[PDB]
């Protein structure tokens, strides 16, 4: 069982840092723009079951985005990341959510698993309030929200445990749908 997870969000919010903290327990203050989309794989235990997570890191800069997007299809979970110190990055979440739905075209979009990460909470200059972020998540059919720090490894393991569990649930349903579709 391979679980495909896609991480989306504006340039600089910490997508690559979150993935590298989780997969490699390493963090760099140095910024290196992500070009295109590619993945790291990690074997993880999901509620006592072994699965391989294919975690796709993507370019936040539009000029660096891959032209091809076939990889979104079949995705099991989409991670939306914003920077709590940068309100513009929280305001683009609907566009990211919509781009994911359009490229992945999942059946039953309202129940597709999304997980939102408000990153860089270690910084002193926060501008996006937890209540405002939670209100948005609730309005998107109650998606899970975690405040993280990739720099200080705060809530990273916890967020990815829910990402893995929800992605497994989704993979499980798609497989069931293919073999036993429910009637109309
Ligand atoms: N203080 C702090 N800095 C962070 C955190 N996560 C990432 N950064 C810093 O923020 C900058 C951008 O991080 P990066 O992971 O490259 O962001 P990204 O979303 O992958 N950008 P892109 O879409 O362009 O590839 C880096 O200098 C990194 O060190 C965090 O939790 N706290
Ligand atoms: Mg990156």
UniProtKB/Swiss-Prot annotation:
Cystine connections: none
Per UniProt, the short sequence motif Switch 1 occupies residue numbers: 22-35
Q: In which tissues is it expressed?
A: Expressed in osteoclasts and in neurons.
Q: Which domain of life is it from?
A: Eukaryota
* Known cofactor(s): Mg(2+)
Q: Which reaction does it catalyse?
A: GTP + H2O = GDP + phosphate + H(+)
Q: Which SMART domains does the record match to this protein?
A: RAB (SM00175), RAN (SM00176), RAS (SM00173), RHO (SM00174)
Cite the GO molecular-function annotations of the record: G protein activity; GDP binding; GTP binding; GTPase activity; retromer complex binding; small GTPase binding
Q: Which UniProt keywords apply?
A: Acetylation, Autophagy, Cytoplasmic vesicle, Endosome, GTP-binding, Hydrolase, Isopeptide bond, Lipid degradation, Lipid droplet, Lipid metabolism, Lipoprotein, Lysosome, Magnesium, Membrane, Metal-binding, Methylation, Mitochondrion, Nucleotide-binding, Phosphoprotein, Prenylation, Protein transport, Transport, Ubl conjugation
Keyword NADP: yes or no?
A: no
Q: Where in the cell is it found?
A: Cytoplasmic vesicle, Phagosome membrane; Late endosome membrane; Lysosome membrane; Melanosome membrane
Positions bearing Phosphoserine:
66
Q: Which family does it belong to?
A: Belongs to the small GTPase superfamily. Rab family.
The record's function comment reads:
The small GTPases Rab are key regulators of intracellular membrane trafficking, from the formation of transport vesicles to their fusion with membranes. Rabs cycle between an inactive GDP-bound form and an active GTP-bound form that is able to recruit to membranes different sets of downstream effectors directly responsible for vesicle formation, movement, tethering and fusion. In its active state, RAB7A binds to a variety of effector proteins playing a key role in the regulation of endo-lysosomal trafficking.
Instruction: State the oligomer form and interacting partners.
Output: Interacts with NTRK1/TRKA. Interacts with RILP. Interacts with PSMA7. Interacts with RNF115. Interacts with and FYCO1. Interacts with the PIK3C3/VPS34-PIK3R4 complex. The GTP-bound form interacts with OSBPL1A. The GTP-bound form interacts with RAC1. Interacts with CLN3. Interacts with CHM, the substrate-binding subunit of the Rab geranylgeranyltransferase complex. Interacts with C9orf72. Does not interact with HPS4 and the BLOC-3 complex (heterodimer of HPS1 and HPS4). Interacts with CLN5. Interacts with PLEKHM1 (via N- and C-terminus). Interacts with PRPH; the interaction is direct.
List the protein's name.
Answer: Ras-related protein Rab-7a
Q: Which organism is it from?
A: Rattus norvegicus (Rat)
Mind giving the lineage of the organism this protein is from? Eukaryota, Metazoa, Chordata, Craniata, Vertebrata
Please state the gene responsible for encoding this protein. Answer: Rab7a
């Amino acid at each position: 069982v391979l679980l495909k997870v896609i991480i989306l969000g504006d340039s600089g919010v910490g997508k690559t840092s979150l993935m590298n903290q989780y997969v490699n327990k390493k963090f760099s203050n140095q910024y290196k723009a992500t070009i295109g989309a590619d993945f790291l794989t990690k074997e993880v235990m999901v509620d006592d079951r072994l699965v391989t997570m294919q975690i796709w890191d993507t370019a936040g800069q539009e000029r660096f985005q891959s032209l091809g997007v076939a990889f979104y299809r079949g995705a099991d979970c989409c991670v939306l990341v914003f920077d709590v110190t940068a309100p513009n990055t929280f305001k683009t979440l609907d566009s990211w959510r919509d781009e994911f739905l359009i490229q992945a075209s999942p059946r039953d979009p309202e129940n597709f698993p999304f997980v939102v990460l408000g990153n860089k909470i270690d910084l002193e200059n926060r501008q996006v309030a937890t209540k405002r972020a939670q209100a948005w998540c609730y309005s998107k059919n109650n998606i899970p929200y975690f405040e993280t720090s990739a720099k200080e490894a705060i809530n990273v393991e916890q967020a990815f445990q829910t990402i893995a569990r929800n992605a497994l649930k989704q993979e499980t349903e798609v497989e069931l749908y293919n073999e036993f579709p429910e009637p109309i």
